[PDB]
Amino acid sequence: CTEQITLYTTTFSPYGHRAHIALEEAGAEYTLCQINVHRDKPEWYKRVNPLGKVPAITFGGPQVPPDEPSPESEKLVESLALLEFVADVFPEAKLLPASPVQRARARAFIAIYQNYLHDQFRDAFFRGEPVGPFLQALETLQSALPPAGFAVGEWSLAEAAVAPFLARMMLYLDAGLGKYSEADGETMRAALASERFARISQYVRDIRARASFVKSWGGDDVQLEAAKAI
Amino acid sequence: CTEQITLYTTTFSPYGHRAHIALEEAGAEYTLCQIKPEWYKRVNPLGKVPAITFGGPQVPPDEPSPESEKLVESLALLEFVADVFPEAKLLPASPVQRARARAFIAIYQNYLHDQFRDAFFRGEPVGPFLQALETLQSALPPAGFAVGEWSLAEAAVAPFLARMMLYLDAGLGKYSEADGETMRAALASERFARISQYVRDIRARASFVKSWGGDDVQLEAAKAIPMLR
Numbered sequence: 238c239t240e241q242i243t244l245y246t247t248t249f250s251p252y253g254h255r256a257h258i259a260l261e262e263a264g265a266e267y268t269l270c271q272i273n274v275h276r277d278k279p280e281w282y283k284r285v286n287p288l289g290k291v292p293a294i295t296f297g298g299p300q301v302p303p304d305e306p307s308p309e310s311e312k313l314v315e316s317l318a319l320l321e322f323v324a325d326v327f328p329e330a331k332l333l334p335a336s337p338v339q340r341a342r343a344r345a346f347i348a349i350y351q352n353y354l355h356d357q358f359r360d361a362f363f364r365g366e367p368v369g370p371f372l373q374a375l376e377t378l379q380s381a382l383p384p385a386g387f388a389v390g391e392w393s394l395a396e397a398a399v400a401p402f403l404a405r406m407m408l409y410l411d412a413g414l415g416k417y418s419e420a421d422g423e424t425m426r427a428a429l430a431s432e433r434f435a436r437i438s439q440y441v442r443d444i445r446a447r448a449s450f451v452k453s454w455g456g457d458d459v460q461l462e463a464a465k466a467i
Numbered sequence: 468c469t470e471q472i473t474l475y476t477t478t479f480s481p482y483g484h485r486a487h488i489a490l491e492e493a494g495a496e497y498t499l500c501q502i503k504p505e506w507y508k509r510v511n512p513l514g515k516v517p518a519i520t521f522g523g524p525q526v527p528p529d530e531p532s533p534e535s536e537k538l539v540e541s542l543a544l545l546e547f548v549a550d551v552f553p554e555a556k557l558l559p560a561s562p563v564q565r566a567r568a569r570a571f572i573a574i575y576q577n578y579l580h581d582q583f584r585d586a587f588f589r590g591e592p593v594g595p596f597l598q599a600l601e602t603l604q605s606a607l608p609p610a611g612f613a614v615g616e617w618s619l620a621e622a623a624v625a626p627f628l629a630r631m632m633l634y635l636d637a638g639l640g641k642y643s644e645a646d647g648e649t650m651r652a653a654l655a656s657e658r659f660a661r662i663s664q665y666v667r668d669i670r671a672r673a674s675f676v677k678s679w680g681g682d683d684v685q686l687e688a689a690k691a692i693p694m695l696r
């Protein structure tokens with residue numbers, strides 16, 4: 238690819254972290270533009286997306302400073318479509334595996350996350366609801382993993398999709414962040430340290446060791462400081 | 468492609484209708500198996516449906532081969548057909564256009580899909596449904612389909628919008644008689660003229676016609692669903 242790529246996200250957004258992982262995995266030449274979550278979003282940002290939706294990608298157009306988005310560039314939103322987008326722009330990076338079947342399983346794995354775990358990370362960590370279903374969806378996602386490696390063997394958009402969220406969960410859990418009760422937090426730290434969740438615990442360590450994740454995570458400290466401002 | 472394709476669905480499933488539309492658009496040679504029989508756990512141990520078996524020997528659908536690949540999750544099944552039949556251009560060619568087709572599905576999934584269910588199956592307040600319908604409508608071009616030519620966007624959303632119109636026209640659903648009145652008038656009003664044509668253009672699409680039973684069959688099916696009363 239020769240078109241310019243710019244990724245817009247609010248700071249340490251896991252949805253934007255998805256697209257960040259994929260651009261790193263893709264070897265892409267891209268600009269990164271973060272926006273301070275707690276500020277209002279600059280006036281210029283409506284030229285990226287009139288509704289203030291984030292994350293977003295601009296693609297093509299002249300090279301421009303991100304805070305001066307060109308009207309010429311194509312603007313794109315929806316984090317999982319942005320992952321698929323990077324894969325299409327950089328087919329040579331094999332962000333998905335090659336065969337249709339393996340690609341279907343990578344996407345299925347994301348769907349397991351979306352349909353079962355994604356909502357319970359917000360019920361349990363932001364709405365303080367009973368944690369049982371969270372742990373059960375975590376088990377459900379865990380069961381779709383192969384015994385080693387990543388969701389379809391080699392790293393894929395599945396990981397781009399799920400890594401930002403699983404990585405924050407452990408970080409939050411280790412830190413006791415969340416709206417859950419002290420009882421449910423003990424109960425979640427205990428489940429995650431048990432053999433029941435060894436596979437998922439291994440899946441997260443291996444995610445965090447991936448270079449594309451490390452670069453786009455920044456370190457646990459900053460994400461912790463970020464988390465404690467929500 | 469030469470591998471065998473078998474699509475498993477329940478008879479009037481919109482999720483299976485998704486995969487059915489896409490296989491028709493693709494020109495695929497495939498078996499269709501509508502239905503839960505004991506044998507189905509060989510397709511998918513969790514009884515998940517729709518499902519596709521892919522490859523292996525030719526077999527009758529109720530005797531799935533241990534060799535065939537089993538795949539589930541309707542939207543991965545859509546993308547799957549597209550990956551197997553790139554020549555059918557089930558998505559457009561450029562990355563930007565493919566991203567907008569996928570963004571359009573996300574608009575349906577994230578804003579309208581759940582509200583369709585609150586209004587028509589949980590008899591919940593209808594206001595939010597109409598706003599998401601407008602929101603999906605706003606992501607359409609003034610003519611044509613979601614990204615111009617027919618795409619997985621249509622395979623993905625057609626089964627649900629086509630069922631919405633049919634239920635509303637039929638007064639099926641758990642909404643109040645008042646909220647049903649409010650929606651029939653809204654869908655016939657200028658506010659929702661673009662989306663009503665969308666459904667019309669969809670319903671004329673050959674792949675839809677074939678994978679739609681006919682309004683008759685879908686109605687007979689619809690009137691045997693409890694959550695519509």
Ligand SMILES: O=C(c1ccccc1)c1ccc(O)cc1O
Pocket residue numbers: 317320321344345347348349351352394540541542543546
């Ligand atoms: O199937 C899904 C999906 C399912 C449920 C919720 C959200 C997404 C899917 C997810 C990622 C992707 O790249 C392609 C896909 O089809």
Ligand SMILES: O=C(c1ccccc1)c1ccc(O)cc1O
Pocket residue numbers: 315316317318319321542543545546569570572573576577619
């Ligand atoms: O982006 C999405 C998506 C987003 C939210 C919910 C469900 C899906 C998407 C939808 C279809 C698809 O084939 C690939 C995709 O990434």
Ligand SMILES: [Mg+2]
Pocket residue numbers: 360366
């Ligand atoms: Mg809940």
